[PDB]
Each structure stands twice: as structure tokens, then as C-alpha cells.
């Protein structure tokens, strides 16, 4: 049972009541490209659908909403709201009437039923909602055997909602953007249907073709959602496509949801990890790290931090990372507490014991370019620590105290250190003197008053962001 009937009857009609009944006020709110006040609310409740009960998580009687609502998908004279109220009163097919299950068997002619019924009077969120919400809340069944093509077929009628989206209603619909919100989400379900066993070969030239119909003319959030797809498939898939960005780099005019812009800067900064652009990556991956604070308590912020701080370890120096300790992280040993301990020590045997010992988890790293200059980061951490400590140091001290076997090898490390501008050392190449020294003029004569155009350029930028922020009401 008696507790399974009342709950989806309540929350389900609370969903489409505000969804259809409010989106009616949205598209009848003739200029609503930014309101969408039950579109984004509805997607907030669909992210709540994947947590909670679905359309019908086969809820112990028959799973009867699917043979209920998509039948008579017709928005005529407003007694069709009473057709949906008949679809409230018929929710006791599980309780009162003859229980008839039609999931995975009649769901394909049910997908034909928005075409089998009469004309959709320009409220496509209900119909593309009926093209996503049946089978994408059935991804949680996880068999993915002959229903890959079923969920894909629901996305084919979503592609019919692309035909009726950007191939119909040629006068300024502005539900096209909300269908780019829903369409982008079920493109992540193209990942969650295709990418379990194949790659999205349709959405290669249809990635760029949905980008083509979402380039300039009515583009909003399709740019960097299709570029999150473009950026995310093409990392496990082979690279140089991020160089295919580089001739046509177009980022948002205005930033989206801070989760999306956060993870987007995490994706492209994670490209600059393997591109080894160390200057921009620390601040855009710092920005991306701090910009996504909401996560599930078992992780994905430790995934974002773990796969974030590797090239930050490869900067040559690093701070001691973040500032908010996590114990399930400590159980999973994701970002290598012991290895960054081997970084701030000048150790090599326990260092390569971490390297050799944990290689099954270095598989979970997948970024083996870390070690090839990270052993070099051990030796540059050593010469940076000792050179930073001593005013003068010599090759007799460091060249065999750090067992570099010879003067000239340390003269090559200091050749690369002066080449990196790390030390202001000098080497007398006659007797074997590193006649190292420390430079002068640390005072605020010139350098901070030069820096104040960066500090105050930053400050005037936040002035103008505050002004443009004031421009909205």
C-alpha cells in the first residue's frame, strides 16, 4: 504494498503539472529565452528522478505510467488537461484495474504514439520529455542488451524532436534552447548508450552537425555542451582533435551553470596537462577545482582533484596541494600522499618503490609522462631546496652529496637551472668551483609597482564584472 501507489502519483503529477502547466506560461510568455522557470526546475527534478523513483522503477505492481501518458499525446482544447487528469485517475490500473505491463515491448509503438496521436501544438518539452524520460531512466537497469537500440530509438524520436525543433516553428520558438538543455543531456545519454560498447559515430559528424545547427544563429549552451562532448570523447578516443579546436576556438559569450563552466575548464585544463602548458593550467584547474564544490560524498571531487594535481606536481615545485582532508580518499589512495612525500623528499629508492609497487594504480593514473620528468622533479627539488637554502654552494657539496657522480653533471643541472632562471649561480670551471651567489634588490623599488597593474587590472576587471552584474535587473 500500500505505500508504493501514493508516492509516484503525487510526485509525478507534481512534475508534469508545473512542467506542462508552467511551460505553457513559458512559451506563452512570448519572450522567454532566460526565464525557463520550470524547464531548469524540471531538469533539477530529473536529476532528482535519477536518484528517486523513475517514471516507474517497475514499482512492484505493473509499471503503468508508460502505457498511460504517451497515449493520447494531444494538447487540444483544454479538456486535454483533463485527459492528463484521466491519466491521474487511471494510475489505479496498478491498484484497481487490470494490471497491464507494456515496458520494453510496447514502448516502441508508444514512441510512435506522439506521431500516432494528433498535432503537437508547439510544446515540445512534453514530447521530447517523452523521448528521454521513458528509457533514459531505464539506463539504471544496466543490462544494455537489445535495449541499447531501444534507448537509442527513443533518441531517434528525440531526433524527430530535432526535426520538429529546428526544422519546424520558423518564428523564434525559444524552446529550442531548452531543448538544447534536454538534448545535451540525452547526448550524454548517447554517451551512456553508445559508449558502453561502441563510439558515437553518428555524433561525430552529428556532433559537428548539431554544432552546425547550433553554431551562431540560435546557439545557447550547445557550444560548450557539444564541446564538452567534443572534449570528453576525444581524450579516451585519440588526440589532435584538441588541436582541431585550436583553429576554431569558440568559448561561451556568457558562462553557463557554474558546474558546467567549472567542469569545462577542468576538461580543457586537463588537456593543457598533456599539452604541458604549466602557466595557464594551474589557474584554470585551480579555478575548476574551487568552482565545483557540490559532489557525492564518496567522491568525484577527489577524482577532479586527483587527476587535477598531477602536472601541478610536475611544475617543478608544488604547494602541499588542497586544504580539506578526506578519509575515503585516504582509503582509495588516489592522488598519492606517499608519492608527493617522495617528491618533497629528495629520495629515489622509496620513490621508485612507489613507482614500481603501485603500477596497477598507475594504470588508473594513465598519465605515465608524470614519472619521466618527475624523477627529474626529484632531482630539481633537491637542487632547488639546497640552492634555495645556501647562499653559496659548490659542486663538492651538492654534486656528490646528491651523488651526481661528477662536477659537470651538476654543472648541467645548474645549466638547466640558470636556463630555467632558478638560481643566480656561477661556476668557475678551472678548479671545480660552483662559485654560486644570490642576487640583490629584493626591495619594492620597481617590481610591486609594476605588479599593481596586474593587481589593479584584476580589480578593475572585478569592478566591471560587478557593473555588468548590476545590469541584469
Amino acid at each position: 504494498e500500500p505505500p508504493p501507489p501514493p508516492a509516484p502519483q503525487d510526485v509525478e503529477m507534481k512534475e508534469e503539472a508545473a512542467t506542462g502547466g508552467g511551460s505553457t506560461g513559458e512559451a506563452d510568455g512570448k519572450t522567454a529565452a532566460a526565464a525557463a522557470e520550470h524547464s531548469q526546475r524540471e531538469l533539477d527534478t530529473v536529476t532528482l528522478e535519477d536518484i528517486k523513483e523513475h517514471v516507474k522503477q517497475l514499482e512492484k505492481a505493473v509499471s503503468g505510467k508508460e502505457p498511460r501518458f504517451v497515449l493520447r499525446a494531444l494538447r487540444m482544447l483544454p479538456s486535454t488537461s483533463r485527459r492528463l487528469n484521466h491519466y491521474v485517475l487511471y494510475k489505479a490500473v496498478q491498484g484497481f484495474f487490470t494490471s497491464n505491463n507494456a515496458t520494453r515491448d510496447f514502448l516502441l509503438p508508444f514512441l510512435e504514439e506522439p506521431m500516432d496521436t494528433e498535432a503537437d501544438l508547439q510544446f515540445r518539452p512534453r514530447t521530447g520529455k517523452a523521448a528521454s524520460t521513458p528509457l533514459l531512466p531505464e539506463v539504471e537497469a544496466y543490462l544494455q542488451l537489445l535495449v541499447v537500440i531501444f534507448m537509442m530509438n527513443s533518441k531517434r524520436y528525440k531526433e524527430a524532436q530535432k526535426i520538429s525543433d529546428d526544422l519546424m516553428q520558423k518564428i523564434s520558438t525559444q524552446n529550442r534552447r531548452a531543448l538544447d538543455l534536454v538534448a545535451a543531456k540525452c547526448y550524454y545519454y548517447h554517451a551512456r548508450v553508445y559508449e558502453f560498447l561502441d563510439k558515437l559515430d553518428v555524433v561525430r559528424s552529428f556532433l559537428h552537425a548539431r554544432l552546425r545547427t547550433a553554431t551562431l544563429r540560435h546557439d545557447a549552451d550547445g557550444q560548450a555542451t557539444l564541446l564538452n562532448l567534443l572534449l570528453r570523447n576525444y581524450l579516451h578516443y585519440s588526440l589532435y582533435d584538441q588541436a582541431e579546436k585550436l583553429v576554431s576556438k569558440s568559448v561561451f559569450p556568457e558562462q553557463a551553470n557554474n558546474n558546467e563552466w567549472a567542469r569545462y575548464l577542468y576538461y580543457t585544463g586537463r588537456i593543457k596537462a598533456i599539452q604541458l602548458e604549466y602557466s595557464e593550467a594551474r589557474r584554470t584547474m585551480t579555478n575548476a577545482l574551487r568552482k565545483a564544490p557540490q559532489h557525492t560524498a564518496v567522491g568525484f571531487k577527489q577524482t577532479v582533484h586527483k587527476l587535477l594535481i598531477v602536472v601541478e606536481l610536475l611544475l617543478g615545485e608544488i604547494p602541499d596541494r588542497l586544504q580539506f582532508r578526506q578519509p575515503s580518499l585516504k582509503r582509495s589512495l588516489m592522488p598519492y600522499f606517499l608519492l608527493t612525500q617522495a617528491v618533497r623528499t629528495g629520495n629515489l629508492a622509496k620513490f621508485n618503490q612507489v613507482l614500481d609497487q603501485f603500477g596497477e594504480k598507475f594504470q588508473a593514473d594513465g598519465t605515465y609522462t608524470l614519472i619521466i620528468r618527475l624523477r627529474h622533479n626529484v632531482i630539481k627539488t633537491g637542487v632547488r631546496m639546497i640552492s634555495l637554502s645556501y647562499s653559496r654552494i659548490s659542486l663538492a657539496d651538492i654534486a656528490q652529496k646528491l651523488q651526481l657522480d661528477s662536477p659537470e653533471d651538476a654543472e648541467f643541472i645548474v645549466a638547466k637551472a640558470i636556463r630555467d632562471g632558478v638560481i643566480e649561480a656561477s661556476i668557475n670551471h678551472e678548479k671545480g668551483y660552483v662559485q654560486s651567489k644570490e642576487m640583490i634588490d629584493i626591495y619594492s623599488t620597481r617590481e610591486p609597482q609594476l605588479a599593481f597593474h596586474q593587481r589593479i587590472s584584476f580589480c578593475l576587471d572585478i569592478h566591471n564584472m560587478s557593473v555588468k552584474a548590476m545590469r541584469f535587473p
Partner: protein, 81 residues
């Protein structure tokens, strides 16, 4: 890549390669952006046959980048194709 291949003096390699261009154009929008000068030379080569098609897929790739006006001038000087 396959556009750099075109140092052969016979143009039928270039028609073979444009037969490749409209084929695998659905992944390789970037390489013509470094091959703009080859589309300029092969466009300004008169008796070379593929100048009009160079204006076609140059209108495609500059359509892709954002040079819709050079896509427009190539669309003018692209012939009946």
C-alpha cells in the same frame, strides 16, 4: 596529413585528394586552416581544374571557421559547381 601529399605535378592526384576531401571532411576541418595557401595557389592556378572545388570546400571550411565572407567570395568564384 593527406592534404600535404599534393607536391605531385599531376593534378589527378588533386582530384583523387578532393575525392578524399568530401569523403573524410567530417573530421578534418583543421588541416585546411593550415592549408589556406594551398587553396590560394590551387585556386589561382587557372588550367588546374580543381580551383572551383577549392572554392567550394574552402567555403565549407571557412564556413566552419567563421570566414563566411571569404566563403562568400569563394562562393562567387566557385562556378556552376
Amino acid at each position: 596529413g593527406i592534404i600535404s601529399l599534393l607536391d605531385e605535378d599531376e593534378p589527378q592526384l588533386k582530384e583523387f585528394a578532393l575525392h578524399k576531401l568530401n569523403a573524410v571532411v567530417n573530421d578534418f576541418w583543421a588541416e585546411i586552416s593550415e592549408s589556406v595557401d594551398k587553396i590560394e595557389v590551387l585556386y589561382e592556378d587557372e588550367g588546374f581544374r580543381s580551383r572551383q572545388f577549392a572554392a567550394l570546400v574552402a567555403s565549407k571550411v571557412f564556413y566552419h571557421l567563421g570566414a563566411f565572407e571569404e566563403s562568400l567570395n569563394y562562393a562567387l568564384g566557385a562556378g556552376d559547381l
